[PDB]
Write an enzyme that holds these catalytic residues in place. Structure first.
Site, short mmCIF file in Angstrom:
data_model
loop_
_atom_site.label_atom_id
_atom_site.label_comp_id
_atom_site.label_asym_id
_atom_site.label_seq_id
_atom_site.Cartn_x
_atom_site.Cartn_y
_atom_site.Cartn_z
N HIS B 137 -64.49 -29.76 10.46
CA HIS B 137 -64.57 -30.62 11.63
C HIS B 137 -65.61 -31.72 11.42
O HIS B 137 -66.70 -31.71 12.03
CB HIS B 137 -64.87 -29.80 12.89
N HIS B 139 -66.55 -35.74 11.41
CA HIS B 139 -66.32 -37.15 11.74
C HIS B 139 -67.01 -38.01 10.69
O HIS B 139 -68.23 -37.91 10.52
CB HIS B 139 -66.85 -37.49 13.12
N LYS B 220 -55.02 -34.49 13.18
CA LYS B 220 -55.83 -34.13 14.34
C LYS B 220 -55.15 -34.60 15.60
O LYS B 220 -54.88 -35.80 15.77
CB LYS B 220 -57.21 -34.78 14.26
N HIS B 222 -56.00 -35.05 19.38
CA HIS B 222 -57.19 -35.20 20.20
C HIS B 222 -56.83 -35.78 21.56
O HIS B 222 -56.10 -36.76 21.66
CB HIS B 222 -58.18 -36.14 19.51
N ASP B 224 -58.39 -37.72 23.45
CA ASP B 224 -58.75 -39.12 23.63
C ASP B 224 -57.63 -40.06 23.16
O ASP B 224 -57.64 -41.23 23.51
CB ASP B 224 -60.05 -39.47 22.91
N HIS B 249 -57.65 -30.65 19.64
CA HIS B 249 -58.58 -30.77 20.74
C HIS B 249 -57.66 -31.09 21.91
O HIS B 249 -57.07 -32.17 22.00
CB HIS B 249 -59.58 -31.90 20.43
N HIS B 275 -63.36 -26.30 18.23
CA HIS B 275 -64.34 -25.97 19.29
C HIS B 275 -63.69 -25.16 20.40
O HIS B 275 -63.59 -25.60 21.56
CB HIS B 275 -65.04 -27.21 19.85
N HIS B 323 -67.62 -39.43 23.79
CA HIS B 323 -66.29 -39.74 24.31
C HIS B 323 -66.19 -41.04 25.08
O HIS B 323 -65.18 -41.31 25.72
CB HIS B 323 -65.79 -38.54 25.10
N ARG B 339 -66.56 -29.29 31.09
CA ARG B 339 -66.54 -28.72 29.75
C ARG B 339 -67.74 -27.84 29.41
O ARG B 339 -67.70 -27.13 28.41
CB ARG B 339 -66.40 -29.85 28.72
N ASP B 363 -68.67 -30.51 13.69
CA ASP B 363 -68.42 -31.64 14.58
C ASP B 363 -69.40 -32.77 14.31
O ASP B 363 -69.82 -33.48 15.22
CB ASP B 363 -68.44 -31.20 16.05
NI NI Z 1 -62.99 -32.34 19.88
NI NI Z 2 -64.90 -33.68 16.92
#
Ligand code: NI
Ligand code: NI
Ligand code: NI
Ligand code: NI
Lengths: 100, 570, 122, 570, 100, 100
Positions: B137, B139, B220, B222, B224, B249, B275, B323, B339, B363
């Protein structure tokens, strides 16, 4: 100034020692990197002062005591080594078991 | 002639029955077996055993059973065991685990572990040796994150991103064929193994699939980018055809569905739930129920690991930044607050201890700390021993069962999940020589030496101007494995089978070792080593209380952790 | 006279969003036991099955709220929301797979919604 | 439903009629137009608009009108306008300026600006976005100068040098085919666009021309190599054949001629006059009269920008070091002193404000500061507003005319001068995606993110070990665009047409994008955007007083500047 | 000492804070990076002292006031974030609007 | 803080000056890099204080005297140059023969 690579690096040790000394002064028991930084900077400043290698090998055992540091720190530090420019050029100081 | 045990361990590292404390935790590992022949231990140095005609063979060419590298007297900690052995490396791979030396004169030499003219030696006596950490995980936000990871013993980064673009700052996504190509080229200069995830979003197959053909190693999904039933479905259809893994996610907002709707869209297909506790994202409040299902490979990210008195207070602002949310928009704050739950974070500690959450991950830089996956794994294990006691499965007063359960979370299990365990993730013969040496006093905190493809890539080492390498300042530094073209041979770019078949490496001029992602779709929770438990997890929608087998899972936050202020300058 | 570096001096007036598009007010209930939050640009008929409202009135529409904001429904909460019309080609693909084409195909969208248990179809 | 303007601007950045202060100056820019459709603004994040089926299209493959990258809600400041738009990037180029998103459901989407599976997002709401700075007076003296330039928003370095050799420490010259080849190879590792100038000196054509064929992008005539009538003439003959630009630093000493003799040697041909005020070099005292001529493209270097109370005192020692002069040689000191004049420095401020000097540049490390071209441009504009008032051409109380005049000096005009404006120098469709994001509070001071060929190359970003990228220390750092082979695709080496035709890139193994220098010989002062004024400039030989249209141009030095002690740690 | 990358970087913050504190002590109004350095170092030293995240979130608002800094500096600093090793491991402190 | 490359580098000069000042305070004759660091940091702090370039050109000649430094150091230092942000932007200070 004509700083070479070691001169640049070793500024960090002095800085870390100053940080650690401020932490000690406000009453904190010092941790592993703090204790190492203080003793190391002490050695390099001692060389600058013109002490001998033999003097620093023994003084280095009396800079910090176990009550200055956190539990287990004395046993984590088997020795501390530092090189500095003495009046007779660069030499290595090894301090064995600096904190009893 | 007999040697007492204290002196034996001081000279050669521990042997059968001896225990070693992990850092400043109260975890103890016990040597289960030892491959040596007492009296014929390998060692290197002035007047030592690995010398020509003696422990080093002077006859055989490199091809004749001779090693490129011998790690002498390693205490291996791995899902496969906790045991004492020499480790032999050749062509960048682990080729032997056993007893190295010279069959001319030593008993019990593993036949392909000859120390010869061609053999380098690393002394592992008194060190714990583990596989390199597999962080799934990641980024890709700031290249300075690589050394941070190496310093805590991570050797593979799986994830996505193009640098500090908002899409990447939120999601592990390198979107589309061009961004993927650019980041594969960037990867040529990163001294760590890498695999890249595409955007697991779309309602048609082709826009998703072309990322796989371009060189992505997975996808992935996600929220978002819209963690909708359609995006979930299309991504899994792609993954099933391409044999790559999908990370999810999920829809925290429950906008298009609740957890059960996401599970229906998944439809029994294999998926890696990121997560899984949910602070890092997912169906509020009950996402963590994912970790009970047989088709889910569940990981935690690290800031909730373990539950401490400061954990909750740091999270709201962390989440809002990651985010791209606004403090003056009430629904943004409500989403963020939804969350963050002590009830699920406390239960997450216990689910790890029970083998219900199978993996750890960082993460990195998007609600997670690049250099604390390994660190926080052991802090969690230590907290659980303190609060729950030794696990029932333990013997001899050792914590070997817990240690195997936990080491698996950041080594073998993420590798299996990603389809890369044929190459990495454990200390086994035939796998790539990504190895981490640890002084026990620094175990899980600061790696001594990180070996990548059989050459040291990173080390805690001192003054480069000094007469020897131990004088101050001792700090983490990149070693020769990272320099020049050697960075190509010591690291792997993991890619889809289709991109490899289509000649993407040649098209882009990639010189790194190319690893194939495979066997991702035919696995489940049962394949997670030491962490294979399926169960019905109930999360109360009113109270957030987590139940397994009719029992509420809860524990207290702690005020202090090991592997913390004794070690760190800041 | 005091300088705030990089400060704005905004002009007078207000910004009207979704100007010229038909607006529709409807009542919506979260019949589920977990909160549901709905973004400004999701095709409204394709939201969570457990939101109860006249599904037909969500077809070809989305929330009439600022771009990037949302409406939050706590468990059991019923509220009135205002919708605006989708623009552009007035097509929707993906999301919940209820449309996959023109939003004009009301009968097909509602048939799919009903078959899959989206609450509030005749 | 209506949103008040303060809240609108806080969420999406400013819109039509709103003004923004540039850093801590008293310059205000006003949004002239906005390409959005109110209510359909693009934005990215948790529960935001750019999600599959919503603002992100889920249907189209990357080839079908989909972007690699969307910068959402940018306030563009460019010679072409000051306005609000989304910016769409594909294949490393700006392909759309307008409104991005999904035509499925949004009104007013620019047809080739679809956000799809392949699209990365950078949030530019609340940021000012400009073209990367084009510095055409660079001495390649110390590689550490590149990050200095990137940090102040410079993305192209044109100039010469081989490192800290005296020739290079004095002159922007990479001399001869071998030094040029070596520096083209060095350039492969510099994360910025580059063009290299050869030595514009000789009395035969072949020694000069062979530099162009070797890969030089232009020539520098410098007095330290003999800025004689012959060297001037031969260099311009070469340039006219090769279609490259010539920069001149003229004969300060008036040894072989006065200004009129240099102009006669130029004979109406196109030339770029460096540091036209003359502290940085040229016919004493009257060199600045060059800037009145239609065939001259005039630039300033930065230490005289703007006229301050300390400006004169720093110059003598600066000049003596740069030009390898000796304090004990009276004529060396006389030469140096002859170049430093408050009368011409004061007039230089005003000539900039009037559009008579068209360009800024650094003179990096040879009487100039690598990271202060952009900085000092805006300090000059601010001083001129304070001393001269708003320009007559302004409306609405904004400084838009002045802002366009000044931004042109370091973006489009140097690009036009050099023959590279087809690739770089402005935010226009079809040009390379070299883009700089600025927080308005830091505008012109410290760049937020510098995008090179569509990938972030440099950013102000924090702790790489942290949970998010914003914690301290926030500093300028190289990003993934600079790493591995991605440095090749995100940067351009500009070269002569002849070297490109002759296959120099293949011969040297250059992997960078190769840019062609062209259309350098068919331009003049009239082609300098917003800075196209020709006039008779009179410089009094006794008093150094500068006159234009019968009026003495003078102004006072200032004791303080904006964009200074509020911002800098040293 | 076994310094990792963050430990090396964060030495800089302490150093910048010491610089800024000397400037304040001789009567200067502090600028943007000076103010940020002081508040950041305060947070990291607070963590070392064993304060909680919540304590530092509120103390961070009282380290510098507007009369300590140049015009516009308070409005330039929307928040300051820092991570440090607390007794319970690394945590993030965010101080919103530290200078009113 | 938004540190640029020069701001990061120049922290080193301040640090080296602090080191050198501690060495002077305990009675040592300063060496070449120590002397340069002290005078350089003095210049940069002077700019921060709002002194003019001309003031610093003359003050820089009175920071250290020959009795503060080792034999030959005064003759090793022909000049010291430093750039700093004055109230009117970055400027260069050159101090010729700073130690007589
Ligand atoms: Ni996430
Ligand atoms: Ni992440
Ligand atoms: Ni010049
Ligand atoms: Ni020059």
């Amino acid at each position: 100034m004509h700083l070479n690579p070691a001169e640049k690096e070793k500024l960090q040790i002095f800085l870390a020692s100053e940080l650690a000394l401020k932490r000690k002064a406000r009453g904190l028991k010092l941790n592993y990197p703090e204790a190492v930084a203080i003793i190391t900077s002490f050695i390099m400043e001692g060389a600058r002062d013109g002490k001998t290698v033999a003097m620093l090998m023994e003084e280095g055992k009396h800079v910090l005591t176990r009550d200055d540091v956190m539990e287990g720190v004395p046993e984590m530090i088997d020795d501390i080594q530092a090189e500095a420019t003495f009046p007779d050029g660069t030499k290595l100081v090894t301090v064995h078991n600096p904190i009893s | 002639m007999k040697i007492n045990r204290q002196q034996y361990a001081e000279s050669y590292g521990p042997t059968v029955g001896d225990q070693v404390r992990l850092a400043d935790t109260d975890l103890w590992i016990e040597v289960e077996k030892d491959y040596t022949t007492y009296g014929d231990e390998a060692n290197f140095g002035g007047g030592k055993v690995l010398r020509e005609g003696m422990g080093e063979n002077g006859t055989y060419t490199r091809t004749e059973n001779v090693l490129d590298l011998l790690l002498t007297n390693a205490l291996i900690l791995d899902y496969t065991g906790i045991y004492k052995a020499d480790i032999g490396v050749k062509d960048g791979y682990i080729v032997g685990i056993g007893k190295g030396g010279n069959p001319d004169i030593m008993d019990g030499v593993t036949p392909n572990m000859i120390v010869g003219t061609a053999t380098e030696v690393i002394a592992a006596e008194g060190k714990i040796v583990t596989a390199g950490g597999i962080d799934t995980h990641v980024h890709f936000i700031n290249p300075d994150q690589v050394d941070v990871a190496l310093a805590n013993g991570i050797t593979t980064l799986f994830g996505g991103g193009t640098g500090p673009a908002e899409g990447s700052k939120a999601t592990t996504v390198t979107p589309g064929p061009w961004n993927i190509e650019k980041m594969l080229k960037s990867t040529e200069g990163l001294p760590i193994n890498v695999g890249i995830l595409g955007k697991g979003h779309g309602s048609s197959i082709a826009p998703i699939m072309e990322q796989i053909d371009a060189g992505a190693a997975g996808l992935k999904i996600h929220e978002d980018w819209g963690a909708t039933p359609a995006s979930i479905d299309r991504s899994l259809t792609v993954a099933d055809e391409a044999d790559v893994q999908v990370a999810i996610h999920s829809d925290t907002l429950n906008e298009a569905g609740f957890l059960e709707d996401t599970l229906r869209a998944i439809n029994g297909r294999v998926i890696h739930s990121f997560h899984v506790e949910g602070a890092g994202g997912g169906h509020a409040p009950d996402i963590m129920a994912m970790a009970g299902h047989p088709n889910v490979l569940p990981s935690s990210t690290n800031p909730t690991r373990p539950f401490t008195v400061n954990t909750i207070d740091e999270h709201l602002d962390m989440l809002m930044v990651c985010h791209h949310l606004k403090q003056n928009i009430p629904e943004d704050v409500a989403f963020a607050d939804s969350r963050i739950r002590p009830e699920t974070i406390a239960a997450e500690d216990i689910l790890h201890d029970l083998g219900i959450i199978s993996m750890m991950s960082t993460d990195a830089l998007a609600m997670g700390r690049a250099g604390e996956m390994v660190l926080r794994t052991w802090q969690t294990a230590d907290k659980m021993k303190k609060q729950r006691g030794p696990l029932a499965e333990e013997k001899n007063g050792s914590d070997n069962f817990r240690a195997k359960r936990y080491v698996s979370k950041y080594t073998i299990n993420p590798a299996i999940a990603q389809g890369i365990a044929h190459e990495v993730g454990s200390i086994e013969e035939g796998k790539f020589a990504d190895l981490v040496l640890w002084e026990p006093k620094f175990f899980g905190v600061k790696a001594d030496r990180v070996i990548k493809g059989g050459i040291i890539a990173y080390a805690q080492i001192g003054d480069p101007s000094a007469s020897i390498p131990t004088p101050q300042p001792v700090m983490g530094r990149r070693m020769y494995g990272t320099v020049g073209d050697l960075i190509h041979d010591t690291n792997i770019t993991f890619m889809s089978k289709s991109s490899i078949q289509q000649g993407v490496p040649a098209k882009l001029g990639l010189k790194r070792r190319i690893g194939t992602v495979k066997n991702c779709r035919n696995i489940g929770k049962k394949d997670m080593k030491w962490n294979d438990v399926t169960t019905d997890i109930d999360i109360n929608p009113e109270t957030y209380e987590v139940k397994v087998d009719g029992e509420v899972l809860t524990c207290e936050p702690v005020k202090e952790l090991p592997m913390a202020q004794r070690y760190f300058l800041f | 006279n005091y300088i705030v570096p990089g400060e704005y001096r905004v002009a007078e007036g207000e910004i009207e969003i979704n100007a010229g598009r038909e607006k529709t007010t409807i009542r919506v209930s979260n019949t589920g036991d977990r909160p549901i939050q709905v973004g400004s640009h999701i095709h409204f008929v394709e939201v969570n099955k457990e939101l109860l409202f006249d599904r037909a009135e969500g077809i070809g529409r989305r929330l009439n709220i600022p771009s990037g904001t949302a409406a939050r429904f706590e468990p059991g909460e019923e509220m009135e929301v205002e919708l605006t019309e989708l623009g552009g080609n007035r097509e929707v693909f993906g999301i919940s797979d209820l449309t996959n084409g023109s939003v004009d195909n009301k009968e097909l969208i509602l048939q799919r919604a009903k078959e899959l248990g989206y609450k509030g179809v005749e």
